[PDB]
Amino acid sequence: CAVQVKLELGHRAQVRKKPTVEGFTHDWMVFVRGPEHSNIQHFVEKVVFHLHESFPRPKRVCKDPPYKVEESGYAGFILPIEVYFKNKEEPRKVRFDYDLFLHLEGHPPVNHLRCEKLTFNNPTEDFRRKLLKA
Ligand SMILES: O=C(COCc1ccccc1)Nc1ccc(Cl)cc1
Ligand SMILES: [Cl-]
């Protein structure tokens, strides 16, 4: 009995009115969530955001919702996101490579969204029950 669930990944980015002391020009926030009123905490163990190496503590871990990271910076980068599942079976996690892009000053703030389909073929009963609760 295969089960399909939905994950939304996205981010916002806005030019700061005043650069930070480091000269960072943008504030941004990247997130993983369920669509509409879906609570993905039923089947998500943790979300790991792998920031660019220039960031302090580049491995950011959210064990509880909201699964998000808020930061400031000066350039966009590819941000690997690992979503770990509440199971003890294959797969333990899934990985997405998120394009954390920023727009130049003058352009409207970034507000970006993509939606990811996860289909689990033959999950264990306990994991199937969690997936179906989201
Ligand atoms: O945007 C930033 C700012 O982050 C670094 C930081 C240093 C000290 C404190 C906070 C944050 N780095 C960055 C570098 C290369 C690429 Cl390709 C994309 C981004
Ligand atoms: Cl991807």
Residue numbers in the entry: 1 to 134
Authors' text:
However, compound 10 bound deeper along the same aromatic groove and thus had a more intimate cavity encapsulation than compound 2 did. Therefore, the benzyl substituent of compound 10 had additional interactions with residues P60 and F28 for enhanced affinity to AF9 YEATS. Sequence alignment of the AF9/ENL YEATS domains suggested a conserved aromatic cage in AF9 and ENL. It is, therefore, difficult to achieve a high selectivity between AF9 and ENL YEATS domains, as underscored by the similar affinity of compound 10 to both AF9 and ENL (38 ± 6 μM) determined by CSPs, even though compound 10 represented a new chemotype with a binding mode distinct from that of SGC-iMLLT. Therefore, compound 10 was a dual inhibitor of AF9/ENL YEATS domains. Compound 10 had weak potency in MCF7 cells using a Cell Counting Kit-8 (CCK-8) assay, but suppressed the proliferation of AF9-sensitive HGC-27 cells more effectively in a dose-dependent manner, which is consistent with the CRISPR result.
Unlike the bromodomains with end-closed binding cavities, the YEATS domain adopts an end-open aromatic “sandwich” cage to recognize histone lysine acylation. The AF9/ENL YEATS domains recognize acylated histones to recruit the super elongation complex and, in turn, DOT1L on active chromatin.
